[PDB]
């Protein structure tokens, strides 16, 4: 039941992640990334493996996802992918911070 409930936490932070609370900042990571309609020709040549909240919510749908570590490595994914593409200061990177701030604060208090 451990699973069960890990990936219930889980599913609870996405919820959270998607929500309106939240939606000030989390807008850019709803969808994968369209290169092509926001001009980023180097994208794809830059990102190898592309990850967004709406791919999470269908792999967790699916029951893609076999425990909370696997979920957590396509969220920081998400992340890791905006760092390295975008400049430092360009605002969707401080969007990033802040839902990186809620996703990791809400995953830390994972049940035992
Ligand atoms: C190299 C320069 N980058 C961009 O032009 C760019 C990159 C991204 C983006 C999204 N994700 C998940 N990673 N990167 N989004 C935008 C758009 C949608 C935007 C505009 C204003 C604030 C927030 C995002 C623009």
Known sequence: ???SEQLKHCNGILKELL???HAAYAWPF???????ALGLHDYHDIIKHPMDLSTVKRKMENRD?????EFA????LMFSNCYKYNPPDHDV?????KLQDVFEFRYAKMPD
């Open 19 to 21: 929500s309106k609370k």
């Open 93 to 97: 990177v401080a969007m990033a911070r």
């Open 73 to 76: 490595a396509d969220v920081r």
């Open 30 to 36: 709803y969808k994968p990334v369209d290169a092509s």
């Open 1 to 3: 039941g451990k699973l």
């Open 65 to 69: 996802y076999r425990d909370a570590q």
